Structure formats: C-alpha cells, structure tokens
Design a protein around this ligand. Structure first.
Ligand SMILES: Nc1ncnc2c1ncn2[C@@H]1O[C@H](COP(=O)(O)OP(=O)(O)OP(=O)(O)O)[C@@H](O)[C@H]1O
Ligand SMILES: Nc1ncnc2c1ncn2[C@@H]1O[C@H](COP(=O)(O)OP(=O)(O)OP(=O)(O)O)[C@@H](O)[C@H]1O
Ligand SMILES: [Cl-]
Ligand SMILES: [Cl-]
Ligand SMILES: [Cl-]
Ligand SMILES: [Cl-]
Ligand SMILES: [Cl-]
Ligand SMILES: [Cl-]
Lengths: 258, 258
C-alpha cells in the first residue's frame, strides 16, 4: 500500500538499537508506536526517511522499492538521489523540536519546500500554505511573525502545516506534543485526530495513551528494539498479552512527561 | 597520603600471580599501570579493594591501616566489616564491564550507593548524581533510560559518574575503554584527563599508551607479577632502562585491542 518497512535493523557504531522491526501502512491507517524511552522509537522513525541509516532492511513506498546499497561504513544508503528526494516528499515528518527556518515568516516557512522542492509557482504554494495554516488554527495576524515570536505550541502547529503543504502520502510524527506546555497538548492531539478522521495515513510515536488508544487503527509496542506486541488498540490496551506490555502500561502511568 | 599498598602478593590456589608489589598514591597522583596481558594488572587492582584476597601485604587508606588477618583458606581477609565498607567508599572502581543495575535507570543507578551505602537523603544523592552525570556528558534525555538501552560508551560514562558520586579519595580504573568501540575511546580518555586536571587521585590500568604517557604523574610497568620498572612517564616511555620494558613497548605497538 503506502509504506512497507521490512526487517529494519539499525546500529550506532557497534551498538545495535533496532533489531528487526517491520511496519505496513495502507491508505488511511493510523499507527501509533508506544514504548519506553530507549526502546528505539525515534531511531525507527528516522530510519523510515533516512535521517538515520539502517544496518538491515528494505523500505517500499507506494509499492515501489527504494534501492539500498551497503556503504563504506557498513550501513545502508539510498542508491539513487532521486529516490531519496522523491522519498522526503512522499513521507514528511513532524518532530519533538519544531524545525522552522528562523529567518522566514510563518507563511514563508510553509511555502518554502513546495516551491523549492516541488517546483510550484509562488501562487500555488501560497494557496496550499493558507489552506493548511487555517487547518491548524494559525491566523493571518500570526502569519507574518517569525518562529522566535511564537510559543512551542504555535511553532508545532506551523510545522504540521508545513508537512501538510507537501501533500505527502504518509505523515510521520515523533512525540509532537512532548515539548509543549501540558495545557496545549490536547489541542494538538485533536488536530492530529482531525487528520485521521479525514483519512490521512499517519505513523505517530507518543506518550499520550489517550491518542494511541482512541485514534489509532493499529498500535505497536516497541521493547528493546523489537516489536513485542501489536494489533488493534482495543486489544493492545484492553487485553495486553505480553507481561512486558502489561508492565509498560502500568509503569507508564506514573512517569511524568511534563 | 591517600593509599599505600605494601608488599602485595596474591595466589589463586597454588598459582602465585602477584609476587610483591607496592604502590603509594598521594593527593593528586595519577598512576598508570601498564604491562602484558597476564602480568597481573587486574589482580593488583582487585586486591586493593578486596574484590580478590591478597596472600601477603598491607593496605593503608588515608594513613589508617586496614587490619588484615590470615583466613581459613590461608589468604588475608579484612578483619573488621566496617573497615571493608569504609574502604569500598573511599576507593571506588570502574571496570572493563559496566556494572550497572539492569532494573534501575541511569539516574537511579548513580543515586543508589550514595543513598544506600552513605545514608544520604534522596535530595542530596540526586544533586550529586545530576552533577556527575553532567560532567560525563549524559544528559537529561538519557537519564531515564536503562542500561540495556545504552551503548558501551554511554554505560561506561554512567559508571564513571556512579564512582564520582561517592566522592571517594581514590578512583581506580581497570582498562575502562577496552570494550568500547574504538571511535569512542578518545572521548573517555579525555574525561579521565579532565578528572586528573581537576586534581583527582587515580590509578589506571590501560593499553592506551597515549593516556599513560600524557596524563600520568607516575607509571608502573608490571612484568610477571612484579614491578619491573617505574617512574615519571617521560623516563619510563622516553628512556626505558629494562630490556623487558623496551621489548614490551615495541611489541605493544602491534597488538590490536579493538
Ligand atoms: N546520535 C546518536 N548517536 C549515538 N547513539 C544514539 C544516537 N541517537 C540515539 N542513539 C542510541 O539509540 C538509543 C536511543 O534512541 P532513540 O533515540 O531511538 O530512543 P527513543 O526510544 O526514541 O527514546 P527518547 O526519544 O525518549 O530518547 C539510545 O539510548 C542511544 O544508545
Ligand atoms: N578467577 C580466577 N581464577 C583463577 N585464576 C585466575 C582468576 N583470575 C585471574 N587468574 C589468574 O591470574 C592471571 C590473570 O589475571 P589478571 O586477571 O591479573 O591478568 P591481567 O594481567 O590483568 O590480564 P587481562 O586483564 O588482560 O586478562 C591469569 O593468567 C590466571 O592465571
Ligand atoms: Cl522582533
Ligand atoms: Cl508550548
Ligand atoms: Cl505526542
Ligand atoms: Cl524497552
Ligand atoms: Cl561502545
Ligand atoms: Cl583504558
């Protein structure tokens, strides 16, 4: 379907972090990945778009394999540059940090990649940027401001609009609400829920079990670099089988994120 | 001064390994012990804190003798338990292996002995743990992770922070970089150099002659259980007298540690 990640491993030097994980997202799937800090969730997402290099595995986007070749360092690299670019355009990522260009206004930040990477006219890029900024609740008065002027919550909403304006096949999110004021978490989770309700294909790493249970079509529990349990949210959360998953669900209640 | 080890011998059963070695560390001394694998370096360090039992010798800490008595097995044991404990608190050790509690987070691992052994309040132990974890470059994001989540290099940095948090009189290190990825060795040697520059009293066994020559105030060449040559690093390395030391320095270049 849209994304198929097969038998992915990843090492940093000699330290193996991901030990064989797979994921398959079909159109409209909303996959939440949960697990302890250190289980390798961020490494998993960063390998999907090659921000990090896998040591083993395959990545297929829209049914087309992304050719990989073993590099100098013994890791896997994307053979063809266009497959890497094509890639970063069909999959977009929203991170814990906001990742906006400090010298560009909110509007310019959302217009930039559609122009520079997709080759769109300024008019077409502006129309997408206005559409998606409205969707995330960033109004005209805020559009001429710069990142330094905005709260973390506002910057993350702008980052979500930036990802949406690329009109990708899959949206990847790595704990997007983790650095936000706790009072602002709900609002961002609701924007992500609205995208899911509109049929977007999404992969989300999160500590907010409310979103993982309530919005996901599939939940993956990552444990020490492997998928220890996965399935429908009602099963994973309501009828956990693995003692490791049961312990994670109990312990997570007391951790303060925030 | 801080530690005086006198005429130490050690046998495993009938096999005599250490055959009369002495060491004296005054405040701020940085003593590196070098020699072939099998010369008895680890046995020497493990006797200092009684992880191994000497067959002959005396150990004096801060000018106070640790009373020893000949045991059932014919080896020497520390007579008084408090002298043994007091001991393990004034001297701390960092090993080739990391020695962290698998069920405790990084932060909990560094706080544990100051609470349990020293009797500190949780607050005082946490303040020491945050201080020393920062010193070894382990940030907040890594502090809530468990040993299984970390590379060897990270685990060793945490182990160094654990030793430092006891605020001991002498830090003992047995080849702390030997099991680390070669790319990570330098960084750990630099942390050890920073401790030396801050005036810490240290005894270090190592195959990294760069540290032994560049950072030590005194170098001991151990050969078949005895000190064959010792002195200032510029003399031991730049003007070796013993043909055994000369042969060790030449042969060591080709050994691969990795
Ligand atoms: N840049 C890096 N260099 C070396 N090792 C890294 C790096 N980033 C991550 N790691 C290793 O991968 C494991 C960590 O990260 P990941 O970032 O995959 O964790 P998570 O499970 O997503 O946790 P969190 O996001 O809470 O840190 C770490 O514990 C560390 O050993
Ligand atoms: N647990 C043990 N039981 C019996 N003999 C031991 C034990 N540990 C060490 N020895 C003896 O002491 C000599 C070894 O160790 P030591 O561990 O002192 O060596 P080193 O010189 O520190 O070398 P390396 O660390 O490279 O092994 C060995 O060759 C062995 O004969
Ligand atoms: Cl301003
Ligand atoms: Cl915020
Ligand atoms: Cl989140
Ligand atoms: Cl885990
Ligand atoms: Cl390592
Ligand atoms: Cl070393």
């Amino acid at each position: 379907n849209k994304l198929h990640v097969i038998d992915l491993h990843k090492r940093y030097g000699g330290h193996e972090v991901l030990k064989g994980v797979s994921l398959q997202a079909r159109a409209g799937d909303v996959i939440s990945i949960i697990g302890s800090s250190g289980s390798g969730k961020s490494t998993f997402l960063r390998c999907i778009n090659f921000l990090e290099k896998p040591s083993e595995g395959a990545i297929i986007v829209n049914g087309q394999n992304i050719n990989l070749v073993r590099d100098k360092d013994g890791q896997l690299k994307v053979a063809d540059k266009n497959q890497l670019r094509l890639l970063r355009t069909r999959l977009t990522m929203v991170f814990q940090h906001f990742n906006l260009w400090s010298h560009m206004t909110v509007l310019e930040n959302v217009m930039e990649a559609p122009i520079q990477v997709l080759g769109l006219s300024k008019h077409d890029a502006r129309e997408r940027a206005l559409k998606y900024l409205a969707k995330v609740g960033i109004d005209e008065r805020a559009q001429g401001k710069y990142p330094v002027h905005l709260s973390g919550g506002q910057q993350q909403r702008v980052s979500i609009a930036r990802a949406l304006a690329m009109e990708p096949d899959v949206l990847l999110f790595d704990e997007p609400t983790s650095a936000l004021d706790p009072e602002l978490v709900g609002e961002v989770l609701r924007i992500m829920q609205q995208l899911a309700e509109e049929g977007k294909t999404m992969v989300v790493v999160t500590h907010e079990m409310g979103f993982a249970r309530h919005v996901s079509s599939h939940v993956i529990f990552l444990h020490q670099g492997k998928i220890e349990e996965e399935g429908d949210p009602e099963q994973v959360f309501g009828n956990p089988q693995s003692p490791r998953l049961q312990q994670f669900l109990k312990g997570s209640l007391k951790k303060l994120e925030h």
